[PDB]
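Ligand-bound model needed. adenosine-5'-diphosphate.
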Amino acid sequence: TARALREIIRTARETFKLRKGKVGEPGDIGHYAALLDFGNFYLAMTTDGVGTKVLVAEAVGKFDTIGIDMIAMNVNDLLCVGAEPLALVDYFAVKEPNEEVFKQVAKGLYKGAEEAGVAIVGGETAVMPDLINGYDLAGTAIGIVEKGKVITGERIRPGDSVIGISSSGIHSNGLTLARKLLIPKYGLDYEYEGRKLWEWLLEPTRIYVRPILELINSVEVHGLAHITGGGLLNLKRLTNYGFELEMPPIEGIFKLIHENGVPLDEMFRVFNMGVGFIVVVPQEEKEEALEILSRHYKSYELGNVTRELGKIKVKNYGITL
Amino acid sequence: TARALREIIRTARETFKLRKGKVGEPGDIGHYAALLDFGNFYLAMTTDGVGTKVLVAEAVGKFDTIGIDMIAMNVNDLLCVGAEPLALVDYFAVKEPNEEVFKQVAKGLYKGAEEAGVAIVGGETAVMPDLINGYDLAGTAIGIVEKGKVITGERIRPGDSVIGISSSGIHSNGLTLARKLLIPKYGLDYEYEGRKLWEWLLEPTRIYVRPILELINSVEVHGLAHITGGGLLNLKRLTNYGFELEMPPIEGIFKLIHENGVPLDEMFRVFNMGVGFIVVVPQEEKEEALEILSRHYKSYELGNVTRELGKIKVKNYGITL
Ligand SMILES: Nc1ncnc2c1ncn2[C@@H]1O[C@H](COP(=O)(O)OP(=O)(O)O)[C@@H](O)[C@H]1O
Ligand SMILES: Nc1ncnc2c1ncn2[C@@H]1O[C@H](COP(=O)(O)OP(=O)(O)O)[C@@H](O)[C@H]1O
Ligand SMILES: [Mg+2]
Ligand SMILES: [Mg+2]
Ligand SMILES: [Mg+2]
Ligand SMILES: [Mg+2]
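Prediction:
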């Protein structure tokens, strides 16, 4: 996947000169959102989809929260440059204009937008049954960050505290491995800790806008990472320094996947393993940061930034990424 | 589709109040781009895909122009609120990450971006074979328009001049009808009026940024319409007044589609029929408008806006929409 993308990223970088010295001049590609220079402030913009989570929603006739996943995926990324989310458009590529599916999608769109503080300002509906085997929901979000208040991770230093905010569950990454591994063996109706497998797989992605905007307005923040594709590897997008981490107990759907033979190092690169968002703050700000985040969701002191460049050591599981 | 979309549109309008009085407060949904209030200017933002034209690219193995279709679909829509395109992200949802395909997609991306004057600032690559039967390429673009310079069509008045700019060909709408009607009977190698069927179907969408930016900076412009889905019906989005039009002769791929049994009333509602972009200007600007446009592409005085309401009379074809 990354080797195929090389040609597109290189070409994209060549277009940057088109907006040189002009409104909207961009930063580099590779971070959680693009930054566009509008003088006093940057506009941040990111585009992200839900993934094959939508195939579970279809089987049980419940798209009621898939719009939450879409909104969460986009606005949580905007947070990772320090931006306040403002607006979103949605791209709905569908096999058919199913009024039942669309009515369900609409319910979660409002719930998500209110929690994220964004207006849904437009969108695109593409009915292409020869191209789409289902209902693929994506979107694009923009937000604003003042010049001088971008948070890319360049301020991360060894000794910084690393704090994790609990995920609500599987979120929207790793669904293809989980679907292929569990559904044929167990059935979608398989009951695990009092909920059906489809409920574990469909649990809507958590939205972190309110705790993170409160955090960055109260304490000095050096890095912010939304845990999506790549798992804990997303931390290396913030800094060259290493991490020493104690990850929380493996529970819920992650335990079920693990007990079905996925190696532990693979799942910390694929699933969020209970931690959906990670923040990096100076050690002296650790307790206030935890107090702020713990108002909103269960949060963990995970560990510390080290001088072991490039390594992520999950000490309590004996895994090094 | 419009029926299935009612609950999504209704719900999206209910989210507008989340940004009431804040940066990014939106205008209404329904137009070619969303308008976001940033004080002295609006940010315009739109999201659009290529459509099943990608199936033709995949069947023949030629992907080096669908990046042009994507960028054209998005930046041409930005023009229709009077905005200058600035930046675009691409959403590439694929069955497989083929490096040859991606290498070609990147050539067309660069050419579209340079002609449109936009930087490609990021994007998203979703590998989902259970959900995608090919290579679906879409994107989101943003532009800027100063307060007091928004061109919505509200200034359109009876008597105004209606000018059409030629398309390059089929552009990116109606491909589902053209593919299903023509390929099984003729094959993609069939020769028609000097070109193969696949060349008729894959001709890249024209980009109108340079002629339209010159036009709005030179003359008074009352409305701008990019001719996409719905064909000439897109004029009804600008105004409730009527139109009296003479459309150019039926040529090339539209002629072959017509000869294969699609009535002209349907094709003026599906295909651009030779006109890719329409502008409405007061009659005293008509000749200067034609001068400017004709320096970029073949353009036509199509007709006038009428005091009569709601109808689009294509006079020389005896058709009323
Ligand atoms: N098709 C694409 N076109 C342009 N840039 C892309 C594309 N896919 C990914 N990128 C860029 O590569 C980086 C990694 O993106 P991704 O792997 O989706 O992670 P994330 O969503 O967390 O940024 C991002 O900065 C993104 O903008
Ligand atoms: N899935 C969606 N969610 C929100 N708004 C949508 C969606 N699909 C279409 N719209 C809105 O409907 C209007 C028409 O959309 P569309 O038919 O794609 O035409 P266009 O690209 O010419 O605006 C646009 O204002 C768009 O923002
Ligand atoms: Mg993302
Ligand atoms: Mg559209
Ligand atoms: Mg469009
Ligand atoms: Mg992404």
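Residues A 5, 8-9, 12, 29-32, 48, 77, 228-229; B 90, 92, 122-125 surround adenosine-5'-diphosphate (ligand 1) (CB under 6 Å).
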